[PDB]
Design a protein around this ligand. Structure first.
Ligand SMILES: *C(=O)N1C[C@H](NOS(=O)(=O)O)CC[C@H]1C(N)=O
Length: 263
């Protein structure tokens, strides 16, 4: 709606920064509203959904098994590793690492999964081969969150990210079991409380992944809808603002409150 578009415009003004927005219909793929859809924004932690899609694609092919146990060390631990720091002795399974990367945004879990597929280049090659020639990953955690202005590394566009998520969640690429595992992890997100979830009415489904980085970077990707079933995809990114994290949270939640109210 124009009201949601106005709310996105307001956010840009109140944050003093670019906001990228896409609202996409899940069944048909039709864009319902957009804002700066072809502009690039840092993905930040939102890339972890695409990373575990690559992992699931390798699981489907038998190049990976979800039960496979990965043992790592203390020198592999990077900043923000709330789950992987607890499993240095027993290791973790690929399934557990994807749950940690998506549900808790564990950074070491993300790096360990990137190694299983061959690094940020193979993730980009995976995205390339599924029809996304726009989104690119180039660096590891935490360096991928630098959000240097006009740097194209580790970026997506609202339009590319929204269509790629759709394909991963509902497209022919992954097997039904893998599509279901990916949306399960996302539905179990526990670090996106103050964003779209804060605007969600009772009984609504949401499966999302948020992120933040340097230079005021903040974002979220989600599939959501009424009656306990997802029906649409929303992508919101921003970068450049000196605003506090709580401000950016509130601006994104008000965009969500807006699109929920004219659903
Ligand atoms: C993702 O952008 N990141 C991982 C972690 N959690 O933040 S999130 O919940 O918004 O994903 C810490 C911050 C950030 C990072 N610097 O990697």
């Amino acid at each position: 709606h124009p009201e949601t578009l106005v709310k996105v415009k307001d956010a840009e003004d109140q944050l003093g920064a670019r906001v990228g927005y896409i609202e996409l219909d899940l069944n048909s793929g039709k864009i319902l509203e957009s804002f700066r859809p072809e502009e690039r924004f840092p993905m930040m932690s939102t890339f972890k959904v695409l990373l575990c899609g690559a992992v699931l694609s390798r699981v489907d092919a038998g190049q990976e098994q979800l039960g496979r146990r990965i043992h790592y060390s203390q020198n592999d631990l990077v900043e923000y590793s709330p789950v992987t720091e607890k499993h240095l002795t027993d290791g973790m399974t690929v399934r557990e690492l994807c749950s940690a990367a998506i549900t808790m945004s564990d950074n070491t879990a993300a790096n360990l999964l990137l190694t299983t597929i061959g690094g940020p280049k193979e993730l980009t090659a995976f995205l390339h081969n599924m029809g996304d020639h726009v989104t690119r990953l180039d660096r590891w955690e935490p360096e991928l969150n630098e959000a240097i202005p006009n740097d194209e590394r580790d970026t997506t566009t609202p339009a590319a990210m929204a269509t790629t998520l759709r394909k991963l969640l509902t497209g022919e690429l992954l097997t039904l079991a893998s599509r279901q595992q990916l949306i399960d992890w996302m539905e179990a997100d526990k670090v996106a409380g103050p964003l779209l979830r804060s605007a969600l009415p009772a009984g609504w489904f949401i499966a999302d992944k948020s992120g933040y980085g340097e230079r005021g970077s903040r974002g979220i990707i989600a599939a959501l809808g009424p009656d306990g079933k997802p029906s649409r995809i929303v992508v919101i990114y921003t970068t450049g603002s000196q605003a506090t994290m709580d401000e950016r949270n509130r601006q994104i939640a008000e965009i969500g409150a807006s699109l929920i109210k004219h659903w």
